[PDB]
From a paper:
The dipeptidyl peptidases (DPP) 8 and 9 are serine proteases of the dipeptidyl peptidase 4 activity/structure homologues (DASH) subfamily which cleave post-proline bonds two residues from the N-terminus of a substrate. While DPP4 and FAP are extracellular or secreted proteases, [name] and [name] are located intracellularly to the cytoplasm and nucleus. There, they play important roles in diverse biological processes such as pyroptosis or ubiquitin-mediated proteolysis, turning them into promising targets for chemical probe and anti-inflammatory or anticancer drug discovery. Here, we show the exploration of the natural product Sulphostin, a DPP4 inhibitor, as a starting point for [name]/9 inhibitor development.
To elucidate the structural determinants underlying the formation of the reversible enzyme-inhibitor complex, we solved the X-ray structure of Sulphostin in complex with a catalytically dead [name] S730A mutant. In this experiment, a much larger electron density matching the complete structure of Sulphostin was found in the active site, confirming that the reversible enzyme-inhibitor complex is formed with a structurally intact Sulphostin residue and the (S)-3-aminopiperidin-2-one moiety is released only after nucleophilic attack by the active site serine. Sulphostin adopts a substrate-like binding mode, occupying both the S2 and S1 sub-sites with the aminopiperidine-2-one moiety, and with the amino group of the (S)-3-aminopiperidine-2-one forming a hydrogen-bonded ion pair to the glutamates E248 and E249 of the EE-helix. Of note, E248 and E249 line the end of the substrate binding tunnel and typically bind the N-terminus of substrate proteins. The (S)-3-aminopiperidine-2-one is thus not a “simple” proline mimic but structurally optimized to span two substrate binding sub-sites and to interact, in analogy to natural substrates, with substrate binding residues in the EE helix. Of note, the analysis of the structure also revealed an elaborate hydrogen bonding pattern between Sulphostin and [name], which matched the observed hydrogen bonds in the covalently conjugated wild-type [name] structure. After forming a non-covalent enzyme-inhibitor complex, the active site serine attacks the phosphotriamide moiety, most probably via a SN2(P) mechanism.
Author numbering:
A (entry chain B): 20 to 43, 52 to 865
B (entry chain A): 21 to 865
The structure:
Amino acid sequence: PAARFQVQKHSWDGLRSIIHGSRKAPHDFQFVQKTDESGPHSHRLYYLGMPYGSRENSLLYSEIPKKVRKEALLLLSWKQMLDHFQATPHHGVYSREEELLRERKRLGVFGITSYDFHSESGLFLFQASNSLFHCRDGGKNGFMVSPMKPLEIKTQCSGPRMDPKICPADPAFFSFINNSDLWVANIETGEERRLTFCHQGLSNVLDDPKSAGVATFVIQEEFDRFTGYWWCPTASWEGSEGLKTLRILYEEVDESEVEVIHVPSPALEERKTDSYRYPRTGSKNPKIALKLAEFQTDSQGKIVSTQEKELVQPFSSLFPKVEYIARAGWTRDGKYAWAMFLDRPQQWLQLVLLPPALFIPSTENEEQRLASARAVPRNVQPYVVYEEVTNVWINVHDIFYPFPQSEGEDELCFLRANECKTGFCHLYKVTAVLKSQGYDWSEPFSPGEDEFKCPIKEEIALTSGEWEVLARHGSKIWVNEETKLVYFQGTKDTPLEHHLYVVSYEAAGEIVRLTTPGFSHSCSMSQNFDMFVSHYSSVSTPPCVHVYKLSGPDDDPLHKQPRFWASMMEAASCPPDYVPPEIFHFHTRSDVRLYGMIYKPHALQPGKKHPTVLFVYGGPQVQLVNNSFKGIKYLRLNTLASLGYAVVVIDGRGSCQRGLRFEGALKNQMGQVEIEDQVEGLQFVAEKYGFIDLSRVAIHGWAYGGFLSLMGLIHKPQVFKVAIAGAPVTVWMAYDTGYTERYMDVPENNQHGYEAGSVALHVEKLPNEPNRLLILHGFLDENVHFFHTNFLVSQLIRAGKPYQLQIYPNERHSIRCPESGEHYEVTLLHFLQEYLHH
Amino acid sequence: AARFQVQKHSWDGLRSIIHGSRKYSGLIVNKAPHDFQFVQKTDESGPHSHRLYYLGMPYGSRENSLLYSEIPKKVRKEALLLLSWKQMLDHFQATPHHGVYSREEELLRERKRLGVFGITSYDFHSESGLFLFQASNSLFHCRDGGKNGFMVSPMKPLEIKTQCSGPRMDPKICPADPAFFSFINNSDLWVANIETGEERRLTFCHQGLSNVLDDPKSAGVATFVIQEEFDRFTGYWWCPTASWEGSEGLKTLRILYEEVDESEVEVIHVPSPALEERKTDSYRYPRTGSKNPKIALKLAEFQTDSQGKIVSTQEKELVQPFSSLFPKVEYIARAGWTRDGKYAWAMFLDRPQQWLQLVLLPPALFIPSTENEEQRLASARAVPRNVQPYVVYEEVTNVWINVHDIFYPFPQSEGEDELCFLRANECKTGFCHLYKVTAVLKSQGYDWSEPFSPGEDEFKCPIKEEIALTSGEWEVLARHGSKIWVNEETKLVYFQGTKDTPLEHHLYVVSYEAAGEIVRLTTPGFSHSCSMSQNFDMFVSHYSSVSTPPCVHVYKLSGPDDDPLHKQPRFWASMMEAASCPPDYVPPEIFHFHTRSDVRLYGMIYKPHALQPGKKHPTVLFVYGGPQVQLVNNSFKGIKYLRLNTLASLGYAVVVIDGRGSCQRGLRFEGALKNQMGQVEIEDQVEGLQFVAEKYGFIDLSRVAIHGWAYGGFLSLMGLIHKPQVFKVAIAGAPVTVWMAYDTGYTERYMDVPENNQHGYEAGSVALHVEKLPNEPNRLLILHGFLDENVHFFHTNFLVSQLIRAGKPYQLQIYPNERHSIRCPESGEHYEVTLLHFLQEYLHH
Ligand SMILES: N[C@H]1CCCN([P@@](N)(=O)NS(=O)(=O)O)C1=O
Ligand SMILES: N[C@H]1CCCN([P@@](N)(=O)NS(=O)(=O)O)C1=O
């Protein structure tokens, strides 16, 4: 039979030398057309980027030429917008507000990480150096040819100005959040005005529990929403004085009843915590309402008045089953505000139109409030234009595109991504009928079943089949109303690649792929539908960023050619010591297709079985196995393979980009099906490849992966010789409402699932042998609290079980510091060297 | 010579060894009765001379209760009387539900090192026979002796009803009138009438604001550093006498209290023991070099009528601010009253803790607190010219002041301008000794309405006489419960000391009239903890040796009344017989040697069990090595240090050395570590280890582990840093890793402020020397209680941060539910199993 390969033993400092030795793209695109026929450029393309000489992200541009040589590859020059400007604060130490927002968004890079852009005026608005800055380019002032100094926006406000946005109707104005309230300011005059008065500014913060315009913890962490306010895109002219009204839809929250937890602050020497309103599963979420903030401006841009407006009947009366606002915004004409509402079980979503006339001025005067309520026209109401229901869960999809209405039309046509209908996320063209029932809004009423529900006149599937339109985590559609085409991203070719597609929403038929097969693409489309960018890679090829021109006859828009135009970034040379993993698939005993990757031992010899690391995440919303470059994020897996470890990765049931039924397998039973699929995958790899030593398998993962590493050691102790569990969830009753309830229900409704899935309650089944269990955790983790590890250790002590522990005192949910990253990898190599070998 | 190899066990094998060692220890923890009060019986016919009251956990109970035993007038000389433990309280549970105390009571128990459940203290008023104590999240009382007579069976204790919100802490009976008691509620001083139920708030420092950090004043409360570093758990003191000033038949009662303002004190967060709530408690933690609380002594007065109704109250403050009168005072160590109530007194320390003043404060120096400037000026002008503070004693040193509790003022004659007192003083000779001091109290007059700036030696009293009652190169014990008993009829002072040997505490008596012969009252070959009857006819000794578990014996002082100094201690009865020395337990052997500098150091050795000649054994150097502790003495170590016997039973040699810095050897000996903590301690540990190896011949110097907790964890790391060829492995429990993160009271005493001793702080902070820790794995195990509010988990967290930056390996264990010490048996067992496993795998080659 096969010989058993022995990894070379190194000293601790030898392992440090291996790790240190081993560690020896433009984004956020805005296309602007140039309208000078004499000049050689069709567009200026703006973006964020860190070029190789820079140590932070800054605002950059490249010039797109009208003509390119067919025989040559143009590499576009990256031009600086800002002149020798440091956007990063001193020592990369952000305010707590900016630091936590960077954690919620998974932003690791320093400098400008987002900007707001107003195309007509050419205004850029962004956070930098613990303040707000702006610059102008294009519009009236024209296009810069060397970097300019950005202008700081002065304030009399105390503490950070968060979530800055330009007023779409009038770019003289921008909005921001300060001390949990919504403000506006005139960028030209410097005038600032507070719009909302939720935050009293009391000495005891726990007595001051309301905010306006703020996405709370669970909304940011579990619903991917980082804003609590939405500019109305249009101005209005109500009243006799001729003042211009500007409007902001905002979420008001009351966190009074939300549980408070303390997490250590990153300034360790101060030995203090930050307080979080952390809704643990089964406990109270914030009380929420949508409100309308208005202010009026004169011809000189002076802010003459402000008004808080609220729903004529309470949010809780109109929409009694709503737990969460997933998303909100406006129709392009500003005729309707809209909101995406979820029930607490997250099995029922409503898309609701809210006309501004349904909101009345807030007042303590009961007679004035009654007068305002009585004056609301009878034909004004909410319209539930769409409803999604499932026995699995609603994934929040960002795709909702309302078409403009004609005058006197009692219908709304819109594009909607819908997963629950077929179990795969697809594009539908929906026509809802908006008919007024007639309501006396001064008279309180409890709405009945389907009270505001709109009849659906038409619902056309634009896409169908066992593949997904991508509608989450930055994915969007682009709609050309001139050509009646919708551009979208999807897995139609393969679940291993993201591609750009186009289909008609008028005459739904042929879907045209616009991206190159054999790569996974992240695309940005011009609002003029003339050009697009793709950031793309493969398992073998590092990322490149290419600009494409949509070319061909204007009478055949569906079959426009994606013509390669220029490169923004050529693929880096694949290092000689880097060997890409190999993708495979197999069918389980239940005949489900699973995909996996194998990092083959480097310089592999036949007839030899190698010690193996099963690298696991295995949780919802993640797919580890796809045809994209893994060497930037997962270099440590190549390093393991270079020492002669085989590394196996399996996307089991519960993982994403395979439809709702596939991820639905773990419903109310997290931990159970995932480990079965991991073991089937490992055993398939051993049978297919023949270089896996099944007597020497380590299971290793972080967060959900740490949870499954422990589940593996508990339930399959003959399969897994050692577990290395990073930031593990050890008790589901300690995780939050938004995530845990979606997949597991509330604890009272799923006692068996919570008990079976909580590894800290099964410590009696963990090994009675030392050196089979290494626990790792960031001390400052505000997501999977250090509590999870602390509670697991308390249980290990009670059960008389041995454990090894490493803490990252300066790290939250991920290891960001390179020295801590290296120490983690050295520790992993040492643990495997000493304890995976017999 | 052959190398002994310890038998390798499985993890579950080690669990069975540790579980067996503790379950079948042959000893009981928290067994001894304590807090003794002797009361004479007044029945000449009856068979008992005294009732003896105490706290004790009787066999067939899981908590401390209030107990008594009857002391017979006659005992048989040839028989051993075992006193029957009688319950005072009828089937009463004093422990709260699931042994979960309020945060206030829990932290007080941590400061006091109280592990036992139930009644942990009582206040007793002997004349009235009133007992006052905390139990079951409330206040209870009972009565026995005096007028009510002596109970023959247990009685139900009476709860004291309140309309206060939150705990009533630090309850005390009014000495002048036992109808009244005091307590602290929400950081303010209250009094109550126990007979009528009437309650009255005296101080109004605590506003009760929603934001606690905007509410930084307390009255009657000892703050964190005072409790943790000065062994003071109260911030108020009853005046022992009533007065009758004013214009009605009203009686005035008085309480001296410390008012503190913690506004400028740094706030830190420590995790709460309810881990599932994921919250912290806020502490006003003065780190070394940062602000201590602003402090003042004030006087609370109230008047009572003939019905015991509280008619009126007054807050009074010093006529000139505390900060003006006493500008160099950082800390109030101690306070109280003269027995006649004529003076309040305070023990003041400067911030360097090198200057102590004993200061008398007459009540007339305190005036009513007021916002009305005209009323305040009138009050200040009315203070008599001859009223002033008196500095009756001053202690100065170039080492540090240890706070000694022994101050006994003799009551003054009317019109006497002198005060006589007994005082324990260490700084005079470098050894703690008893002095009879006479100070002259004369005033040359002050205008208290005029703004005040004290000169050098303002208020300083001439010393007429200072008699040394004790002398030599040994100590009177004056700290951590040690006290004197003064019989004014016989002119004798009873005290404890190290006169016979630094290895044993003994009870002594000497005359304070004609200072001469010191008589020892306790048996040599044991260390004694004694309680004396207030009638000086009987005493209790709680005593043990290295070889004999503790017993508690009652002794009668007998002989001719005309020769009180030579009264003979006669064994009378047993409160608790010594358990048999367990067959599996082998006592350690005490030795001494002289260093190369000719300092005598004491040590102990646990020999490997069933030792064979010509065999070198792996060795554990068990270390504390910090100030205020002596590990090596002739007392039983098997209750607290059973794990050292367990190590010896597997064939480890265990060595303990009391190096320079350790206590019970005088100020010069402990003063060696001044401004250089870490440096001399390791030199003495290594000399001790090397002496033991040369003398005993069974030490394998190639296989030595260093292990300690707290200061011992600090020294374990210092050993591995500075002597990496001596120490193969270090196991550091709850280590201090950065002195700049420890508190004012302790750190500044031994090290000065960071700004004045940058080199000492740098050299003594092991977290700043991680580059010198081993680059090899399995040489360093760190252990820490997650909830430690003393040596914060931060010390370990910061050490780990530095280890990561330096690219060093480490092993780590946390005790999620433990503070500064491991109290839970499951955690204690897990710690010992982990230690055995670490030594088994990594001390062997
Ligand atoms: N709240 C969840 C959302 C799904 C992904 N994750 P993580 N653990 O994968 N984030 S990450 O920053 O580790 O990628 C979560 O924590
Ligand atoms: N603040 C000091 C006072 C002196 C003794 N100690 P420890 N470390 O000996 N505590 S103990 O509870 O272990 O006895 C201190 O922490």
